[PDB]
Design a protein around this ligand. Sequence first.
Ligand SMILES: N[C@@H](CCC(=O)N[C@@H](CS)C(=O)NCC(=O)O)C(=O)O
Ligand SMILES: N[C@@H](CCC(=O)N[C@@H](CS)C(=O)NCC(=O)O)C(=O)O
Lengths: 233, 221
Amino acid sequence: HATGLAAKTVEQHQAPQDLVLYAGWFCPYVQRSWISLEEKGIPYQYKEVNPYKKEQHFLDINPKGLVPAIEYKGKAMYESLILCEFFEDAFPEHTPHLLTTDPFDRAYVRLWVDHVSKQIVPTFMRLVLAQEPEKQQEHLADFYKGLRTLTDKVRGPYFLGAQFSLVDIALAPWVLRDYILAENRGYEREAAGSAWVAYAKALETRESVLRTQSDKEHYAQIYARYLRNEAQS
Amino acid sequence: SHATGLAAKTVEQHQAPQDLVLYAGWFCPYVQRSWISLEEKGIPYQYKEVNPYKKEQHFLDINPKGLVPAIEYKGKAMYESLILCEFFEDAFPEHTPHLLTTDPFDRAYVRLWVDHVSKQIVPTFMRLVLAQEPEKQQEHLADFYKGLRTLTDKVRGPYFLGAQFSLVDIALAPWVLRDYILAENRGYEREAAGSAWVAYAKALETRESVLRTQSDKEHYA
Ligand SMILES: N[C@@H](CCC(=O)N[C@@H](CS)C(=O)NCC(=O)O)C(=O)O
Ligand SMILES: N[C@@H](CCC(=O)N[C@@H](CS)C(=O)NCC(=O)O)C(=O)O
């Protein structure tokens, strides 16, 4: 179960609601969708899914079995980024608009969300799973490269500037987890450049992000998560 | 090096300058996705052919990654076919049809299945072209059929959502137009994927906006 401030948030979201969020406290993809709900003040019921003992209703409405998922007005959806966009569409008067209202900026947000999903997050995983120091160093260099492609475009404090957006939300969960890299894979924020130092700090101090954060897990736990993902591959 | 057939007429019809400039390659199925959306929605555009062997400096200036499709609109530029398709919905909100629908849940549903097209079906198709060994080719073809049935399990007909044409259809159509490559070179035939695939491919490749973007066929080279 969730701990820290996240435990407070879970306890405040036990009541039934039209929107049900099927979550895992540990899951960074869930955190993306959870941050969006906390940013926009959308009402939601939080249900904790134990992946080792998934309940039957969850599987009926969500047979692929991933979190996050939602049920809303009797229909179900999954995929963290799709849910983030769905919250924008389905609660149109619940500001902030995390894609902006501007058509080009919305496209630019989607482009850089894609960079997070395609480059940054997969390399984070490959670095955790790299075994030889040489392969670890190669994947760490690639992590820096992918971080720096993004920080080249960060206006500050957030990706678009003052306006928090889905680019920030897509990435923030992995900032919260980068102590794993610092403690086990030779990473330091400073080695990716000062812009990353400042942007990481901005993401991890965002109040919505803090409200979804549990106590730090151990390396063995996340490594176990990645081996389970491999086993489901 | 230029569009042919029906596509050459469409190109000829879009040489005048417009607010929206589409940087295109006639052969590119990703370009076709974005081109189809413009033709569905009646958005004014100017078509510019990018020859990949001699890219204009201005195209590289405003689009350093140098991919097509790309657009220039109001001094700003963007690329990635599906992002452009969503951009057309947002930037031209009164040009119907709304190819992701106007319903929040159905929009998410469309996004989910565009992803399955984008992340599963098209990559498998591409692994099957490049595979050379019976080993990888037999595997990728089986995978390809698996992805098609999974999709046609949800096709309502004539199109993915039913009567309403959508970005799921658009994301896949260019590879329906190209599946003769698989048929002539990799043991593929629509009929092995089920009657539903046969009908849905027919529906996609007879779509007027699709036909407008269709050049003569290329060879396995
Ligand atoms: N692409 C998905 C990834 C979601 C995902 O992989 N979630 C993991 C937990 S972090 C999961 O639910 N795995 C299924 C399981 O452990 O049984 C998304 O963006 O939501
Ligand atoms: N993910 C891109 C793929 C675009 C792509 O690969 N375009 C090819 C043409 S089919 C290209 O421009 N390659 C660069 C070149 O050949 O110069 C999209 O969806 O737009």
